[PDB]
Amino acid sequence: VNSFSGYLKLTDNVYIKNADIVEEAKKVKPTVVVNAANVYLKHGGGVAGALNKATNNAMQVESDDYIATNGPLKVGGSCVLSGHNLAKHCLHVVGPNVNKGEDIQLLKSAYENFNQHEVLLAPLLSAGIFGADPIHSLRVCVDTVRTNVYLAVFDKNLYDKLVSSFL
């Protein structure tokens, strides 16, 4: 039993809700919140910009030190950093950005990072400003993630479409 509330159950391990991931994280304080990161951990917009803003830019400060030490992530890769005031940990995961020409096949590799954590609050990878089809992202999530994932979908219209089209 966990404290996630109001989710629709899609499969044995995947759950979904129309919610603002920032507000969800502040309420639940999950062990892991997933950020829709880029390889430079520049949290300018989308989910990343919103999560970083909610940390009063502390996420960005920590991320800049991480990059200065380690260099950029790989597309499809991840790193674990602090969750600040939102969660114990933030798993920064880089899905492919279609508006940069990146290979959508890397979306499966991106979701594989979730399997290193027993329970996660997450957005749909490569959705929103990353330019992928969110219906496809949900399909890859369900077919790749084996741990317990709670998906927050900000847009109500999109949430309803994802549920109604789910096979």
Ligand SMILES: O[C@H]1COC[C@@H]1Nc1ncnc2[nH]ccc12
């Ligand atoms: O699938 C994501 C990528 O593009 C649009 C979607 N964005 C979001 N999803 C959940 N909570 C959110 N809070 C702020 C932005 C946001």
